[PDB]
Nucleic acid binder design. Structure first.
Ligand SMILES: [Mg+2]
Ligand SMILES: [Mg+2]
Ligand SMILES: [Mg+2]
Ligand SMILES: [Mg+2]
Ligand SMILES: [Mg+2]
Ligand SMILES: [Mg+2]
Ligand SMILES: [Mg+2]
Ligand SMILES: [Mg+2]
Lengths: 194, 95, 108, 58, 132, 90, 47
RNA sequence: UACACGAGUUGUUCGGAAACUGAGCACAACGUUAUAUCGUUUUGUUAGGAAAGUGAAGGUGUGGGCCAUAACUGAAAAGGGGCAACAGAGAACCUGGGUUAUAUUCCAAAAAGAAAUUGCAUGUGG
RNA sequence: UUGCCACUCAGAACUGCUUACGGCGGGGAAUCCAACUGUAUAAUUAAAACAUAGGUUUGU
RNA sequence: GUGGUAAUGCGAUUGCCAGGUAACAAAUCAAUCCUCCCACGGUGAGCUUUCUUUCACCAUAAUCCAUCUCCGGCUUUGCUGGGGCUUGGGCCUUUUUACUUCUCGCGUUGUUCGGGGGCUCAAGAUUGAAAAAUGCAGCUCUCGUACUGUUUGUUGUGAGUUCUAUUAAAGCAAAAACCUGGGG
């Protein structure tokens, strides 16, 4: 249920004598036996997790984390990544550009892998059949197939009903609209083909 | 049954009107190749014991077992006889 | 006279666990379970998952009682590691301490 | 069941304390010595007149 | 030049697979019983365990022994190193022959040396354990 | 020379339209294609799972690329790393 | 059941097979060690 | 296959449990609720102090220690228990035969035999 | 170098049905609709409906 | 604990860590197994105006022991080692393949390994024990009574073994117990 490869990375447990085992999303290029470094003074090879305010600027970082410690949230689906834009050493916060254009500011002590998440280019191979969409979501959750609400009865959906399959009222619904009504284009601020 | 089994090993087998399934279903196509290719390899490993050079007169021809150019075990042995001679004739005319 | 047979035990299902058909000295042809022949002792899955030589594929009962030398060679890391994955582990355990104590100590 | 490949070790393990019975056997082409210990039966099959010898006493 | 006698190696690929062992007699080519390079060598099957510094007693003897083997190991089963022991390739390197009835007493002298040469401070490395 | 125009996609025949078959053919021909491993040297990478490439001859698993080995923006990323390591050190 | 036999009928018991009949009543078969004849107990116990 | 009476189901090893985990369940705690029979609950619980598995000095027959059981302490050790699979995992037995009806279940001592196996024991091997 | 352990096909004449278990596509030309396999009104509706891949949009 | 250059052989134990087994979808393909057939040879009953031989039976369980000798040496008194069964593997040692060679499988591939010996591995056969007094059964005679036979070879199909291809934006459970090792 994920296009990105998960790399099983083992570290040593700093305190006990074990070898703690860590499951991480794999930056593209990272292979079995690469000796990954994830600390403060870590080098910046393609896969290391050196801190975000210590990575050079204009660099390419995946698996960045918003809060300092949440263990990686952002830029973590396949092929996705963030570009570091600006450091503000007076504030101590880095402004990285999320893989949606929406560029935000995070603290300069967050951690971040170096590279692109594996499995890039998944979304470009077309499915060609309903059966290859069956097996995609059977590892993911249970939302397939999508019955159009306009093909439903006017008891089960706000669009359903009529002698023709038409949305009776404008599809763009309010941001404030109650759930069960907030269906269609939610708070659509720009509508339709550009 | 053994009256037919006696009369169906030497001759009087099925005919154009006794067949009911395709020839690739009666006598498979994938196993008349298989056997006929085991034989062209069971014969070339026989001929690395003491037969011809077996480096470039075996594997020049090991891929001709699987290239459908020999259509029988016999059909193979004249082709190595056509080449073994000038493999010892070019080794004869040499001055 | 072609007898058919039964699942003698109480499990009458054809799971990969049962897999039972032998003739009997009383000619009462009847079928018996097999053992599920386990894959043998292997190297770690990470390190090129391969069967170890000098080791048997004994089941939980054969393994729990047979001798210890039926499941391990007399090397170091025998029965967990193959000679390939020992000999490479001894030079890497030594070529590293060599490149260390010369390069961790070059500061007079 | 084990088959004693010995005349010394057999006469040792055959003269042990378990000795549930010693069933003298006559079969074609051999003569077989079934000692019944508590957990095995140890056989000593032989092709010689030594059968009738170690039959009287053993 | 590389495999001189008295030079310590690591016995790779054998029963003693990670042990440190010193070459005492190398060879080049034998006829039928050693087509391989034939460096006979004595080495450690029993490392002297760490001196506890606690109950200094006969237990320090029972835990500072050096058990010794002698094998003519092929050269592709060693790993030569930088070190030496200087264990008399010309004095001891000949009274340790390998023929039958010798591996009984010849083995107990290169053992009889490692007895004292560890009890004395000579190498302090050859008698550690190659941790792998 | 079987199947003169649409190749690997002969599995489908008339179905799925020409261009979806052709857009998916470019990506179906590469995931089955063996790639080169700067490790062993010889072409050995197969695609044991999406974004996962294994080299039997090399016995090591590189990660990355859904239908190729290295997405051609990792090709730029992989350099910018050392670009921003070496020149950013020396 | 073995202990009880020996405590009630001073005979040895080797194999005591039991079964809860389709009456809720537990039957018991009892081998008498081949040294206490069973036909000499049913005649004693009065079976 | 009705009615009546009488009988009939035999296991160290077969199935199940004792003894695995799965989807999942939810006792405790905790929270919430007028109220709970509510919710959280193994990809590890709980504002959260959740446990004898071991090692020991000392106690004890007796020529003060030879030797030995035992008490009662208490050595580190994070992540409370617990269910849920008669098709997953696991699981030490095979033939021969003498019931009106049971048998891998029964057979008694020329066990009709032959095995495997668990527990505790005495003892030959170091 | 001709010894022993193979029923498959090919051809020949020979004869005789132009009469022969069982099992076993009618085909072609078009128009319309849906692209397709798929699902679906258990007990009157299997469709041209749903799904679908694809396309786009919106929110984040 | 001790042997073999080495694959790895052999001998009689209590807590951490690391592995391993459990533990894996379906495919295609080659021997055991069993089913069936055929050629066998042997037994019983069937057909017979005829014509001929049709059909039945011929069995080997779990668990074990060791590869008999080819050979040292054809058994002196018997060593140097009691190794071997083969075909699929994985390796080991020793000598090589560069003029593109080569090794492959029915098959999508292996080398940058090619032969000679060895080390194991799991199928699997084999002798031996179980094991013939069993069992099937006919019999000469009269549940008694005895003994005469206690036979393997071929094919074909199959279930597992074999090789952790192919659909994969599908990559095709987990755990105990158990096992081995490092430290002990
Ligand atoms: Mg409404
Ligand atoms: Mg509305
Ligand atoms: Mg396995
Ligand atoms: Mg009734
Ligand atoms: Mg509750
Ligand atoms: Mg596995
Ligand atoms: Mg065949
Ligand atoms: Mg586990």
């Amino acid at each position: 249920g994920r296009g990105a490869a998960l790399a099983r990375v083992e570290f040593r447990h700093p305190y006990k004598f074990r070898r703690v085992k860590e499951l991480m999303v794999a930056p593209e290029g990272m292979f079995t036996g690469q000796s990954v470094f994830c600390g403060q003074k870590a080098p910046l090879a393609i896969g290391n997790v050196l801190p975000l305010g210590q990575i050079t600027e204009g660099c390419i970082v995946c698996n960045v984390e918003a809060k300092p410690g949440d263990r990686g949230t952002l830029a973590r689906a396949s092929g996705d990544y963030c570009i570091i834009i600006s450091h503000n050493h007076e504030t101590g916060r880095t402004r990285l550009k999320l893989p949606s254009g929406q560029k935000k500011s995070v603290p300069s002590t967050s951690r971040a892998m170096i590279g692109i998440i594996s499995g890039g280019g998944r979304i470009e191979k077309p499915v060609l059949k309903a059966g290859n969409s069956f097996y995609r979501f059977r590892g993911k959750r249970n939302c397939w197939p999508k019955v159009r609400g306009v093909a439903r009865n006017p008891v089960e959906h706000p669009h359903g009903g009529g002698n023709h399959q038409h949305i009776g009222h404008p599809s763009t619904v309010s941001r404030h609209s109650p759930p069960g009504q907030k269906v269609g284009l939610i708070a659509a601020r720009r509508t339709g083909r550009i | 049954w053994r009256k037919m089994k006696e009369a169906k090993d030497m001759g009087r087998h099925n005919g154009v009107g006794r067949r009911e399934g395709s020839r690739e279903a009666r006598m498979p196509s994938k196993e008349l190749w298989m056997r006929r290719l085991r034989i062209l390899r069971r014969l070339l490993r026989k001929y690395r014991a003491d037969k011809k050079i077996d480096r470039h007169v075996y594997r020049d021809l090991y891929v001709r077992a699987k290239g459908n150019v020999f259509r029988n075990k016999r059909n193979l042995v004249e082709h190595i006889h056509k080449i073994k001679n000038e493999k010892k004739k070019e080794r004869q005319l040499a001055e | 006279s072609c007898p058919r047979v039964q699942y003698r035990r109480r499990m009458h299902y054809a799971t990969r666990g049962n897999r039972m058909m032998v003739r009997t000295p009383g000619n009462k042809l009847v079928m018996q379970k097999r053992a599920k022949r386990s894959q043998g002792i292997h190297t770690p899955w990470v390190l090129g998952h391969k069967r170890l030589g000098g080791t048997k594929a004994l089941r939980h009962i054969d393994a729990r009682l047979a001798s210890r030398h039926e499941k391990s060679v007399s090397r170091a890391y025998g029965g967990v590691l193959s000679h390939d994955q020992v000999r490479d582990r001894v030079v890497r355990a030594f070529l590293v301490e060599e490149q260390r104590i010369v390069k961790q100590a070059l500061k007079e | 069941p084990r088959e004693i490949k010995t005349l010394k070790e057999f006469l040792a393990i055959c003269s042990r304390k378990d000795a549930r019975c010693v069933k003298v056997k006559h079969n074609p082409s051999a003569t077989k010595f079934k000692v019944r210990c508590s957990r095995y039966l140890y056989t000593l099959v032989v092709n010689d007149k030594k059968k009738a010898d170690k039959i009287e006493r053993s | 030049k590389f495999l001189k006698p008295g030079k310590v190696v690591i016995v790779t690929a054998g029963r003693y697979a990670g042990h440190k062992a010193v070459i005492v007699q190398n060879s080049d080519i034998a006829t039928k019983e050693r087509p391989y390079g034939r460096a006979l060598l004595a080495g450690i099957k029993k490392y002297p365990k760490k001196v506890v510094r606690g109950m200094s007693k006969q237990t320090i003897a029972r835990r500072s022994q050096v058990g010794v083997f002698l094998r003519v190991v092929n050269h592709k089963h060693f790993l030569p190193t930088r070190y030496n022991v200087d264990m008399s390739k010309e004095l001891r390197g000949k009274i340790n022959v390998s023929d039958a009835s010798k591996r009984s007493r010849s083995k107990r002298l290169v053992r009889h040396v490692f007895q004292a040469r560890y009890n004395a401070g000579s190498s302090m490395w050859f008698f550690q354990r190659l941790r792998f | 020379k079987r199947t003169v125009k649409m190749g690997v996609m002969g599995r489908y025949g008339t179905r799925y339209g020409a261009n979806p078959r052709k857009r998916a053919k470019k990506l179906e021909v590469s995931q089955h294609a063996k790639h080169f491993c700067s490790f062993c040297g010889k072409f050995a990478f197969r695609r044991k799972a999406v974004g996962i490439w294994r080299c039997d001859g090399c016995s090591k698993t590189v990660a990355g690329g859904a239908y190729t080995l290295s997405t051609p923006n990792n090709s730029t990323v992989r350099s910018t790393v050392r670009r921003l390591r070496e020149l950013a050190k020396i | 059941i073995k202990k009880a036999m020996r405590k009630l009928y001073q005979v040895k018991a080797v194999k005591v097979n039991t079964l809860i009949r389709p009456d809720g009543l537990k039957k018991a078969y009892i081998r008498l060690s081949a040294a206490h004849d069973a036909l000499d107990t049913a005649n004693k116990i009065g079976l």
